[PDB]
Design an enzyme around this catalytic site. Structure first.
Site, PDB file in Angstrom:
ATOM      1  N   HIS A 174      -1.846  16.931  21.137  1.00 13.22           N
ATOM      2  CA  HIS A 174      -0.470  16.606  21.497  1.00 13.22           C
ATOM      3  C   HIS A 174      -0.231  16.437  22.985  1.00 13.22           C
ATOM      4  O   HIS A 174       0.740  15.804  23.390  1.00 13.22           O
ATOM      5  CB  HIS A 174       0.482  17.652  20.916  1.00 13.22           C
ATOM      6  CG  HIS A 174       0.666  17.526  19.437  1.00 13.22           C
ATOM      7  ND1 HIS A 174       1.578  18.274  18.726  1.00 13.22           N
ATOM      8  CD2 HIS A 174       0.050  16.729  18.536  1.00 13.22           C
ATOM      9  CE1 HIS A 174       1.514  17.941  17.450  1.00 13.22           C
ATOM     10  NE2 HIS A 174       0.596  17.006  17.310  1.00 13.22           N
ATOM     11  N   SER A 196      -2.223  10.355  20.421  1.00  9.82           N
ATOM     12  CA  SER A 196      -3.401   9.732  19.824  1.00  9.82           C
ATOM     13  C   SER A 196      -3.992   8.542  20.555  1.00  9.82           C
ATOM     14  O   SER A 196      -3.311   7.879  21.326  1.00  9.82           O
ATOM     15  CB  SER A 196      -3.102   9.293  18.389  1.00  9.82           C
ATOM     16  OG  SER A 196      -2.684  10.367  17.576  1.00  9.82           O
ATOM     17  N   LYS A 239       2.793   6.892   5.522  1.00 12.54           N
ATOM     18  CA  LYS A 239       1.422   6.408   5.459  1.00 12.54           C
ATOM     19  C   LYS A 239       0.482   7.562   5.131  1.00 12.54           C
ATOM     20  O   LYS A 239      -0.494   7.374   4.412  1.00 12.54           O
ATOM     21  CB  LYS A 239       1.034   5.732   6.781  1.00 12.54           C
ATOM     22  CG  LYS A 239      -0.133   4.764   6.654  1.00 12.54           C
ATOM     23  CD  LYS A 239      -0.336   3.979   7.937  1.00 12.54           C
ATOM     24  CE  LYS A 239      -1.673   3.281   7.912  1.00 12.54           C
ATOM     25  NZ  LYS A 239      -2.070   2.797   9.255  1.00 12.54           N
ATOM     26  N   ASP A 240       0.797   8.762   5.626  1.00 11.16           N
ATOM     27  CA  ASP A 240      -0.027   9.943   5.367  1.00 11.16           C
ATOM     28  C   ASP A 240       0.112  10.359   3.903  1.00 11.16           C
ATOM     29  O   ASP A 240      -0.843  10.850   3.286  1.00 11.16           O
ATOM     30  CB  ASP A 240       0.378  11.115   6.282  1.00 11.16           C
ATOM     31  CG  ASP A 240      -0.216  11.012   7.681  1.00 11.16           C
ATOM     32  OD1 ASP A 240      -0.872   9.988   7.978  1.00 11.16           O
ATOM     33  OD2 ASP A 240      -0.029  11.958   8.481  1.00 11.16           O
ATOM     34  N   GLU A 248     -26.902  21.180  -0.747  1.00 12.60           N
ATOM     35  CA  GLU A 248     -25.694  20.509  -1.194  1.00 12.60           C
ATOM     36  C   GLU A 248     -25.795  19.150  -0.510  1.00 12.60           C
ATOM     37  O   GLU A 248     -26.343  19.068   0.581  1.00 12.60           O
ATOM     38  CB  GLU A 248     -24.445  21.270  -0.721  1.00 12.60           C
ATOM     39  CG  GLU A 248     -24.336  22.740  -1.198  1.00 12.60           C
ATOM     40  CD  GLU A 248     -25.114  23.738  -0.353  1.00 12.60           C
ATOM     41  OE1 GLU A 248     -26.362  23.700  -0.345  1.00 12.60           O
ATOM     42  OE2 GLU A 248     -24.464  24.570   0.308  1.00 12.60           O
TER      43      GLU A 248
HETATM   44  C1  HEM Z   1     -10.838  21.682   9.688  1.00 13.03           C
HETATM   45  C2  HEM Z   1     -11.178  20.374  10.414  1.00 13.03           C
HETATM   46  C3  HEM Z   1     -10.341  19.485  11.142  1.00 13.03           C
HETATM   47  C4  HEM Z   1      -8.978  19.243  11.040  1.00 13.03           C
HETATM   48  C5  HEM Z   1      -7.970  19.908  10.096  1.00 13.03           C
HETATM   49  C6  HEM Z   1      -8.636  18.199  12.009  1.00 13.03           C
HETATM   50  C7  HEM Z   1      -7.407  17.615  12.166  1.00 13.03           C
HETATM   51  C8  HEM Z   1      -7.063  16.603  13.077  1.00 13.03           C
HETATM   52  C9  HEM Z   1      -5.739  15.991  13.061  1.00 13.03           C
HETATM   53  C10 HEM Z   1      -4.563  16.492  12.212  1.00 13.03           C
HETATM   54  C11 HEM Z   1      -5.816  14.934  13.910  1.00 13.03           C
HETATM   55  C12 HEM Z   1      -4.806  13.853  14.123  1.00 13.03           C
HETATM   56  C13 HEM Z   1      -4.919  12.682  13.159  1.00 13.03           C
HETATM   57  C14 HEM Z   1      -6.146  11.841  13.405  1.00 13.03           C
HETATM   58  O1  HEM Z   1      -6.174  11.102  14.411  1.00 13.03           O
HETATM   59  O2  HEM Z   1      -7.082  11.914  12.584  1.00 13.03           O
HETATM   60  C15 HEM Z   1      -7.115  15.031  14.590  1.00 13.03           C
HETATM   61  C16 HEM Z   1      -7.558  14.206  15.641  1.00 13.03           C
HETATM   62  C17 HEM Z   1      -8.789  14.279  16.287  1.00 13.03           C
HETATM   63  N1  HEM Z   1      -9.802  15.171  15.858  1.00 13.03           N
HETATM   64 FE1  HEM Z   1      -9.780  16.460  14.320  1.00 13.03          FE
HETATM   65  N2  HEM Z   1      -9.731  17.828  12.819  1.00 13.03           N
HETATM   66  C18 HEM Z   1     -10.772  18.574  12.246  1.00 13.03           C
HETATM   67  C19 HEM Z   1     -12.048  18.424  12.681  1.00 13.03           C
HETATM   68  C20 HEM Z   1     -12.476  17.623  13.725  1.00 13.03           C
HETATM   69  C21 HEM Z   1     -13.891  17.354  14.060  1.00 13.03           C
HETATM   70  C22 HEM Z   1     -15.030  17.988  13.313  1.00 13.03           C
HETATM   71  C23 HEM Z   1     -13.896  16.484  15.133  1.00 13.03           C
HETATM   72  C24 HEM Z   1     -14.956  15.891  15.763  1.00 13.03           C
HETATM   73  C25 HEM Z   1     -16.235  16.651  16.118  1.00 13.03           C
HETATM   74  C26 HEM Z   1     -12.505  16.262  15.496  1.00 13.03           C
HETATM   75  C27 HEM Z   1     -12.098  15.428  16.544  1.00 13.03           C
HETATM   76  C28 HEM Z   1     -10.843  14.894  16.753  1.00 13.03           C
HETATM   77  C29 HEM Z   1     -10.440  13.963  17.842  1.00 13.03           C
HETATM   78  C30 HEM Z   1     -11.313  13.500  19.003  1.00 13.03           C
HETATM   79  C31 HEM Z   1      -9.154  13.596  17.555  1.00 13.03           C
HETATM   80  C32 HEM Z   1      -8.284  12.573  18.305  1.00 13.03           C
HETATM   81  C33 HEM Z   1      -8.359  11.310  17.442  1.00 13.03           C
HETATM   82  C34 HEM Z   1      -7.716  10.091  18.068  1.00 13.03           C
HETATM   83  O3  HEM Z   1      -6.587  10.216  18.585  1.00 13.03           O
HETATM   84  O4  HEM Z   1      -8.348   9.013  18.033  1.00 13.03           O
HETATM   85  N3  HEM Z   1     -11.665  16.798  14.535  1.00 13.03           N
HETATM   86  N4  HEM Z   1      -7.878  16.046  14.014  1.00 13.03           N
HETATM   87  C1  SMA Z   2     -23.177  35.084   7.985  1.00 13.46           C
HETATM   88  C2  SMA Z   2     -23.152  33.623   8.239  1.00 13.46           C
HETATM   89  C3  SMA Z   2     -24.212  32.818   8.469  1.00 13.46           C
HETATM   90  C4  SMA Z   2     -25.617  33.314   8.502  1.00 13.46           C
HETATM   91  C5  SMA Z   2     -23.968  31.396   8.695  1.00 13.46           C
HETATM   92  C6  SMA Z   2     -24.890  30.468   8.984  1.00 13.46           C
HETATM   93  C7  SMA Z   2     -24.541  29.092   9.128  1.00 13.46           C
HETATM   94  C8  SMA Z   2     -25.441  28.156   9.416  1.00 13.46           C
HETATM   95  C9  SMA Z   2     -25.169  26.687   9.509  1.00 13.46           C
HETATM   96  O1  SMA Z   2     -23.762  26.360   9.537  1.00 13.46           O
HETATM   97  C10 SMA Z   2     -23.204  26.329  10.843  1.00 13.46           C
HETATM   98  C11 SMA Z   2     -25.784  25.935   8.295  1.00 13.46           C
HETATM   99  C12 SMA Z   2     -24.949  26.125   7.012  1.00 13.46           C
HETATM  100  C13 SMA Z   2     -25.921  24.428   8.638  1.00 13.46           C
HETATM  101  O2  SMA Z   2     -26.778  24.314   9.801  1.00 13.46           O
HETATM  102  C14 SMA Z   2     -26.170  23.716  10.945  1.00 13.46           C
HETATM  103  C15 SMA Z   2     -26.503  23.589   7.482  1.00 13.46           C
HETATM  104  C16 SMA Z   2     -26.406  22.101   7.844  1.00 13.46           C
HETATM  105  C17 SMA Z   2     -27.944  23.994   7.132  1.00 13.46           C
HETATM  106  C18 SMA Z   2     -28.337  23.194   5.952  1.00 13.46           C
HETATM  107  C19 SMA Z   2     -29.496  23.615   5.121  1.00 13.46           C
HETATM  108  O3  SMA Z   2     -28.976  23.980   3.888  1.00 13.46           O
HETATM  109  C20 SMA Z   2     -29.831  24.388   2.869  1.00 13.46           C
HETATM  110  C21 SMA Z   2     -29.179  24.742   1.664  1.00 13.46           C
HETATM  111  O4  SMA Z   2     -27.801  24.707   1.505  1.00 13.46           O
HETATM  112  C22 SMA Z   2     -29.978  25.157   0.543  1.00 13.46           C
HETATM  113  O5  SMA Z   2     -29.248  25.481  -0.596  1.00 13.46           O
HETATM  114  C23 SMA Z   2     -29.935  25.846  -1.801  1.00 13.46           C
HETATM  115  C24 SMA Z   2     -31.411  25.209   0.660  1.00 13.46           C
HETATM  116  C25 SMA Z   2     -32.053  24.856   1.896  1.00 13.46           C
HETATM  117  O6  SMA Z   2     -33.428  24.870   2.114  1.00 13.46           O
HETATM  118  C26 SMA Z   2     -34.303  25.255   1.048  1.00 13.46           C
HETATM  119  C27 SMA Z   2     -31.258  24.432   3.045  1.00 13.46           C
HETATM  120  C28 SMA Z   2     -31.853  24.054   4.373  1.00 13.46           C
HETATM  121  O7  SMA Z   2     -33.071  24.059   4.611  1.00 13.46           O
HETATM  122  C29 SMA Z   2     -30.851  23.628   5.419  1.00 13.46           C
HETATM  123  C30 SMA Z   2     -31.391  23.224   6.750  1.00 13.46           C
END
Ligand code: HEM
Ligand code: SMA
Ligand code: CDL
Ligand code: PEE
Ligand code: PEE
Ligand code: HEC
Ligand code: HEM
Ligand code: HEM
Ligand code: SMA
Ligand code: JZR
Ligand code: JZR
Ligand code: FES
Lengths: 365, 241, 49, 73, 49, 62, 99, 66, 181
Positions: free
Chosen positions: A187, A191, A213-214, A257
């Protein structure tokens, strides 16, 4: 108001901008179905799997709430990946705070979904808990200690299941607070838009234009979710999790998954423990580096042909890695996966920054 | 061997998007489980009451439950005792534990069947193919005693002897009990067992599709109505010259 | 002069009932609002269901 | 960020019609299709190739895998 | 695991210097026909088949 | 001089916020009975002879 | 000829189809914002209208008739003299801050 | 009492693809059968044959079942 | 990051003369954090099935490292919470703080939510008081005419307090404190 109703918005944001609100809806959906499932779920290893079947067979509409939660997690990832892709393509990452919080959000949702999958205590639940927590064992000197501490023992067991229910229960609310912070930083700037050019000369009010639209977008999300829940509830799931956990046997075709397949392919491509874990961590954390790798004089890829071609190559590559993650560790998949893994980092760290510079040259600046 | 034979797609009457299970077929399938599979396979998540209004009336199910004896207790003397089964009882287990099961089956463990269809790629296509697919080992293949060749089982060597064949049981409705008929009905029953919500989700899905067919274009119309203000707007630049 | 400013032609966007500049548009206003509001009421009914 | 404080604009006129005075679907198909076709064509060379490559790698790798599992590939 | 003669001979024939975790089979067993191990993969914990 | 249909609907149910909400409440109630009855009929017809309600008569006789 | 791919690139980039000039598409950082602030009235107002016209076309997912596309040979950098000086000024300050 | 599975299997085995496969199968049976020692078995040939025959069975079988 | 941490704490203007009676607001914040921290750690070992709830609590107190201190800190912390709540309300009545209508009425909601929260927590160990407290208090709703009894059975998930009740109460007790926050 002014955080919604009269919030200024670009007149031209496209459907790619609908995923933020859709992520909010996926989060609310998971929280609502989650709480209702938690009203009937028990975390003791002797009864976890049983309580889940009890939900699906005897709790009124327990089956629909359960499959909505399971498939809702899949919709959550589809939306997350679309949301991140939009950001990379349009240069939304230049909103640094918003972007980095987003990276934290991605990691927290991943951790959250991981723990939830462990709750029904089926075969995949058990081995996923085993493998993923063991990623920490790559940490030198103390890694193994950290794993046993997380497990509450020398192996995944009761202590593990019980604390995972607690972690999975609270983390989504933390995600909600982090998401509110995500929006507050957004904000401050408002955007970005498909052109990557400031839209201050043509802002329109969020209501009624984007509120309607949403809502249309929300309807389409619900259609996709319900097509899965009512017509193919197991399509995106794994049959092996319908088998109770067996600590003495890891299924021969165990696979993650679908939304974790690309990362799993990357880790599997490296025949070294620490190396694979570092590549896994980096495949996600590299998102934090994107802003520093931006070389183009223009924010969005809309007017950048070469960058667009490399962007779709990255998407096609993630599709390749997803496919490879679903295949056995055999020829020629081992090599295709290694190339795809190398290509992933090469596109992000070298080819895209280079295309950016070339495009600048071609425009004479 | 590491070779794989994937099952073909049978045209189950419940295959279609809006197609329900055939309940007379569920009913015959239950008879198959009861007379044949229950002596080695448990079905721990289905109780007699679940059959009511699905494939048996409340009285028929009540009579079915009473055909067996289940343990209950303790009584006032602190002892366990046997009694006729009732609707709330879950189907009897053939063995007290997996060890006893393995012992009774040359070391192999008959898995519980409540979710077997959802717990196997191919579902009923797989189960039907397995049940009706036993055949002689190909030349050069020799199995250890206790194992049977079945091309659809992973590795092709299974610890379960062919369980069904013509006339393995008699159906309550006189349907000819050919091996394929028996397999087809038990598979339909196993689908219901793994997914009792099967018919209701499809009925709901029909309603969801109809509602979406109505709501999506209407909301879209609402979207276009509001946006028309912007979509037809005209701009003009008039700088001072 | 600001009097050189004329509103562009919108005939390509107008609902047919308001295409005649020599007729009162009030004669069709209730019909036009009724159509759009009917879309809104039906939608709300479907959502309530 | 609030309307009234976004930026400076001079000499721009905007003409608009009430949504009740206009059609919500003007030339929906007559002009919409041509525009979809145009947009589709304008991007295809940038979007499709990588996916075609995926397809080729996908079919090649899968076939190579099967062939390798039999006696006479 | 109850090992066969061919298995025992195959393990004895291994080029220990080429192993990443170099050990002769006889440094890992007491009675060759028997190998006893904790069935946990040293990578990330699954059970080897 | 007879006004169109949407015109009558506007004046009779949509113009007043009270009357516009009444129409949606009552409308939804009628819509609900007709839609469920219709959809249920379509579902049962598509699956004629397969549902418990279709074969039930063969086993009862209270 | 490099120049050959250049005109090709210009048209592939396509901001000309929205009636924009190359400088209308630059990413705005603080140097750029300062340079825009220094623009004389006419260059500023023209920029505003071209951007506004482009945002409007984008919203309708449309482009201008080909005859109205910015022509490669006629696109000139109106922002360059201003941005170059703003950057020079900042560099001078940065040098002084290190001494 | 005849199982339509028998009838249908017989009919399906008449298809060109099934005969070709059965032939390769018998060729393997003869080849493997005549050596006092051989690693080879005819699993692959049997599965190819079954895959072709069962694809055909699946399209007809259920017409004969209740 | 600075502001609202800040101008909402560091340079927040405060009366020069507020007494110790004004300390209970921060003490309530601390009781809430304490309950949340000890609560989460207990929840890492607690199981809500009636066959194992009481047992899991003894397991916490007997075998979990320092489980006993975390448990008694949670139990006694709930008592400290109320002591502070009552001192806080008393201060408000005596000094006329209730004239801050919004703050005051939100406070009344806070008192009710903490009472409901503490009630549900007490049910979790499934001892005798747990069971009869669940029975009596949920039954207060049965005084509601026409639907009272229906509401009770709906809350219970049955015709009496049983497994369904204990399991949902763990869920309610888990989330309510964060809502209170
Ligand atoms: C629980 C997950 C998330 C929620 C609820 C969320 C929600 C939002 C919302 C409500 C907007 C505004 C609408 C839109 O432009 O899409 C937004 C914008 C944005 N979000 Fe997220 N977000 C999440 C995860 C992420 C992730 C994982 C990234 C990227 C690594 C991210 C990056 C951004 C950026 C850069 C904007 C600005 C977009 C623009 O104005 O072009 N968001 N997000
Ligand atoms: C107490 C909390 C703890 C320890 C949290 C830890 C979180 C770690 C990471 O999240 C941030 C992690 C989920 C994320 O890594 C970035 C995933 C992409 C890793 C994906 C992942 O999945 C597998 C999986 O689902 C399986 O299912 C049956 C079996 C698997 O191999 C046999 C895998 C596996 O080899 C990998 C690399
Ligand atoms: C799997 C993933 C599942 C995730 C969940 C789903 C997420 C959905 C994302 C949101 C998309 C919907 C949305 O709000 O965008 C409106 C989006 C914008 O279309 P529009 O309102 O017609 O806008 C006109 C264009 O700006 C002007 O362009 P035009 O003139 O070329 O017309 C385009 C239009 C009409 O063209 C024709 O097809 C004719 O075609 C359509 O979009 C229909 O419409 C849709 O995509 C949904 C319509 C469905 C009814
Ligand atoms: C992570 C692992 C997930 C595995 C990947 C799954 C593969 C799924 C790929 C299918 C994606 C659907 C693509 C359809 C859209 C095609 C399209 O229209 O492209 C052209 C179009 C032209 O638009 P403009 O340049 O703005 O000009 C407008 C002129 N009127 O380009 C766009 O719409 C760009 C928007 C891209 C955003 C979505 C990208 C897809 C998402 C995939 C994951 C992304 C990577 C990030 C993951 C890192 C971890
Ligand atoms: C009952 C349960 C629902 C059944 C589900 C089955 C699926 C059937 C799908 C429905 C078919 C799509 C129709 C949706 C409604 C059409 C709509 O809202 O678009 C309006 C659109 C606007 O055109 P413009 O020229 O841009 O503006 C007006 C200028 N004078 O008009 C049209 O294209 C169609 C014109 C005829 C009117 C249609 C009826 C409007 C809807 C009212 C709700 C009706 C009652 C509900 C019962 C449904 C049976
Ligand atoms: C004891 C004599 C049995 C009878 C009667 C039936 N089955 Fe069986 N079954 C048995 C064993 C010992 C096993 C284990 C096989 C192994 O080698 O692992 C099984 C297995 C199955 C399976 C699972 C196969 C898999 O993919 O893992 C299924 C689907 C199965 N059996 C089904 C089944 C049905 C429906 C039966 C009644 C017609 C039946 N079995 C009877 C032992 C015995
Ligand atoms: C970011 C939000 C959330 C995500 C992504 C998520 C994801 C998941 C996943 C993937 C599973 C496995 C589903 C399965 O196959 O059975 C699961 C299970 C479960 N989740 Fe969540 N969840 C979320 C929020 C919540 C919340 C807030 C609660 C409860 C307060 C919750 C409660 C449960 C319960 C009790 C189960 C076990 C029963 C089941 O498996 O369906 N979840 N969750
Ligand atoms: C306003 C905050 C809270 C209050 C007032 C409160 C109050 C109580 C009370 C009175 C008990 C019974 C104690 C006993 O055994 O005698 C209890 C038990 C319990 N509470 Fe809380 N609680 C709070 C927050 C939390 C939170 C946030 C969680 C978990 C995330 C939690 C988890 C538990 C658990 C697991 C028990 C059962 C174990 C036990 O009896 O000690 N509580 N709580
Ligand atoms: C699902 C959630 C539900 C149903 C929440 C309901 C919450 C209700 C109220 O909180 C707002 C309530 C706790 C609060 O009333 C204002 C208390 C002061 C009521 C105090 C209270 O306690 C008892 C108690 O603890 C017992 O223990 C063994 C036994 C009791 O008699 C035998 C009582 C009792 O007779 C009363 C009045
Ligand atoms: C939305 C379109 C998804 C493509 C359908 C295939 O989906 C895949 O099916 C496999 C088995 O059939 C599963 O093991 C896998 O997890 C699933 O993603
Ligand atoms: C991604 C492909 C980039 C190749 C550089 C483009 O090169 C250009 O191609 C045009 C059409 O073929 C020619 O008319 C033009 O003379 C040529 O310079
Ligand atoms: S290869 Fe990774 S856990 Fe064994």
């Amino acid at each position: 108001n002014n955080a919604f109703i009269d919030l200024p918005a670009p007149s031209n944001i496209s459907s790619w901008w609908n995923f933020g609100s859709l992520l909010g809806i996926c989060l609310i959906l998971q929280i609502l179905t989650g709480l209702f499932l938690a009203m009937h779920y028990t975390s003791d290893t002797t009864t976890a799997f049983s309580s889940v079947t009890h939900i699906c067979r005897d709790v009124n509409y327990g089956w629909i709430i359960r499959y909505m939660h399971a498939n809702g997690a899949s919709m959550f990832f589809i939306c997350l990946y679309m949301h991140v892709g939009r950001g990379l393509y349009y240069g939304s990452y230049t909103f640094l705070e918003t972007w980095n919080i987003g990276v934290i959000l991605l990691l927290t949702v991943m951790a959250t979904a991981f723990m939830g999958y462990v709750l029904p205590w089926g075969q995949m639940s058990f081995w996923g808990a085993t493998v993923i927590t063991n990623l920490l064992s790559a940490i030198p000197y103390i890694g193994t200690n950290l794993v046993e501490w997380i497990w509450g023992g020398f192996s995944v067991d009761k202590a593990t299941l019980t604390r995972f229910f607690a972690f999975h229960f609270i983390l989504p609310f933390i995600i909600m607070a982090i998401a509110m912070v995500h929006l507050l930083f957004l904000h401050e700037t408002g955007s970005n838009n498909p052109t990557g050019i400031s839209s201050d000369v043509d802002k329109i009010p969020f209501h009624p234009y984007y509120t309607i639209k949403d809502i249309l977008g929300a309807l389409l999300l619900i259609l996709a979710l319900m097509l899965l829940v009512l017509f193919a509830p197991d399509l995106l799931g794994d049959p092996d999790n319908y088998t109770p956990a067996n600590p003495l046997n890891t299924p021969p075709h165990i696979k993650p998954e679908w939304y974790f397949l690309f990362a799993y392919a990357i880790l599997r491509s490296i025949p070294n423990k620490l190396g694979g874990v570092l590549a896994l961590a980096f495949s996600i954390l590299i998102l934090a580096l994107i802003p520093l790798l931006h070389t183009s004089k223009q924010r969005s890829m809309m007017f950048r042909p070469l960058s667009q071609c490399l962007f779709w190559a990255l998407v096609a590559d993630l599709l390749t890695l997803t496919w490879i993650g679903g295949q056995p560790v055999e020829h020629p998949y081992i090599t295709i996966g290694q190339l795809a893994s190398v290509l992933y980092f090469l596109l992000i760290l070298v080819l895209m920054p280079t295309a950016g510079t070339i495009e600048n040259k071609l425009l004479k600046w | 061997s590491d070779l794989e034979l994937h099952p073909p797609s049978y045209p189950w009457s419940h295959r279609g998007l809006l197609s329900s299970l055939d309940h007379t077929s569920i009913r015959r399938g239950f008879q198959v489980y009861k007379q044949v599979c229950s002596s080695c396979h448990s079905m721990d998540y289905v109780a007699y009451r679940h059959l009511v209004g699905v494939c048996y009336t409340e009285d028929e199910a009540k009579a079915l439950a009473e055909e067996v004896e289940v343990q209950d207790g303790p009584n006032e003397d602190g002892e366990m005792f046997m009694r006729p089964g009732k609707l709330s009882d879950y189907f009897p287990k053939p063995y007290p534990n997996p060890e006893a099961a393995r012992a009774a089956n040359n070391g192999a463990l008959p898995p519980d069947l409540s979710y077997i269809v959802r717990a196997r790629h191919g579902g009923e296509d797989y189960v039907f193919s397995l049940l009706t697919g036993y055949c002689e080992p190909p030349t050069g293949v020799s199995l250890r005693e206790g194992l049977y060749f079945n091309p659809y089982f992973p590795g092709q060597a299974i610890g379960m002897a062919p369980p069904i064949y013509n006339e393995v049981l008699e159906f309550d409705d006189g349907t000819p009990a050919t091996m394929s008929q028996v397999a087809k009905d038990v598979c339909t029953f196993l689908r219901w067992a793994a997914e009792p919500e099967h018919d209701h989700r499809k009925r709901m899905g029909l309603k969801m599709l109809l509602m979406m067919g109505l709501l999506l274009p209407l909301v879209y119309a609402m979207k276009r109505h509001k946006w028309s203000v912007l979509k037809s707007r005209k701009l003009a630049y008039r700088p001072p010259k | 002069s600001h009097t050189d400013i004329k509103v562009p032609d919108f005939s390509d966007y107008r609902r047919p009932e308001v295409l005649d500049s020599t007729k009162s548009s009030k004669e069709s206003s209730e019909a036009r609002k009724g159509f759009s509001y009917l879309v809104t009421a039906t939608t709300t009914v479907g959502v309530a269901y | 960020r609030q309307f009234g404080h976004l930026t400076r604009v001079r000499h721009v006129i905007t003409y608009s019609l009430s949504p009740f005075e206009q059609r919500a679907f003007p030339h929906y198909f007559s002009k919409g299709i041509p525009n979809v076709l145009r947009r589709t064509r304008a991007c295809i060379l940038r979007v499709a190739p990588p996916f075609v490559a995926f397809y080729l790698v996908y079919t090649w790798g899968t076939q190579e895998f099967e062939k390798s599992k039999r006696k006479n590939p | 695991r109850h090992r066969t003669k061919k298995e025992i001979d195959q393990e004895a024939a291994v080029e220990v210097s080429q192993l990443r975790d170099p050990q002769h089979d006889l440094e890992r067993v007491k009675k060759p026909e028997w190998v006893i191990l904790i069935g946990v993969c040293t990578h990330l914990g699954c059970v080897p088949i | 001089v007879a006004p169109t249909l949407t015109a009558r609907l506007y004046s009779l149910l949509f113009r007043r916020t009270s009357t516009f909400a009444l129409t949606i409440v009552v409308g939804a109630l009628f819509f609900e009975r007709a839609f469920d009855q219709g959809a249920d009929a379509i579902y049962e017809h598509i699956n004629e002879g397969k549902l418990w309600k279709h074969i039930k008569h063969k086993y009862e006789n209270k | 000829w490099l120049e050959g791919i250049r005109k090709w690139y210009y048209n592939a980039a396509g901001f000309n189809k929205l009636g924009l000039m190359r400088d209308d598409t630059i990413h705005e950082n603080d140097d750029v914002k300062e340079a825009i602030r220094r623009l004389p009235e006419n260059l500023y107002d023209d920029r505003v209208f071209r951007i506004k016209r482009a945002l409007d076309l984008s919203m309708r997912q449309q482009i201008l008739p080909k005859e109205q596309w910015t022509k490669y040979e006629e696109d000139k950098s109106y922002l360059e003299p201003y941005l170059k000086e703003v950057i020079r000024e900042r560099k001078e300050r940065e040098e002084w801050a290190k001494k | 009492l005849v199982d339509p599975l028998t009838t249908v299997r017989e009919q399906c085995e008449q298809l060109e693809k099934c005969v070709k496969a059965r032939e390769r199968l018998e060729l393997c049976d003869e080849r493997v059968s005549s050596r006092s020692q051989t690693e080879e078995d005819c699993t692959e040939e049997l599965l190819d044959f079954l895959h072709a025959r069962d694809h055909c069975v699946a399209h007809k079988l259920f017409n004969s079942l209740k | 990051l600075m502001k609202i941490v800040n101008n909402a704490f560091i340079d927040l203007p405060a009366p020069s003369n507020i007494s110790s009676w004004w300390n209970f607001g921060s003490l309530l914040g601390i009781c809430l954090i304490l309950q949340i921290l000890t609560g989460l750690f207990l929840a890492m070992h607690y199981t809500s099935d009636t066959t194992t709830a009481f047992s899991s609590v003894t397991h916490i107190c007997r075998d979990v490292n320092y489980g006993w201190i975390i448990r008694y800190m949670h139990a006694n912390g709930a008592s400290m919470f109320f002591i502070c709540l009552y001192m806080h309300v008393g201060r408000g009545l005596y000094y006329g703080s209730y004239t801050f209508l919004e703050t005051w009425n939100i406070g009344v909601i806070l008192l009710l939510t903490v009472m409901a929260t503490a009630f549900m927590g007490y049910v979790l160990p499934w001892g005798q008081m747990s069971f009869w407290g669940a029975t009596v208090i949920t039954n207060l709703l049965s005084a509601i005419p026409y639907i009272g009894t229906n509401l009770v059975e709906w809350i219970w998930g049955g015709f009496s307090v049983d497994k369904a009740t204990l399991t949902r109460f763990f869920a309610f007790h888990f989330i309510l404190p964060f809502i209170i926050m």
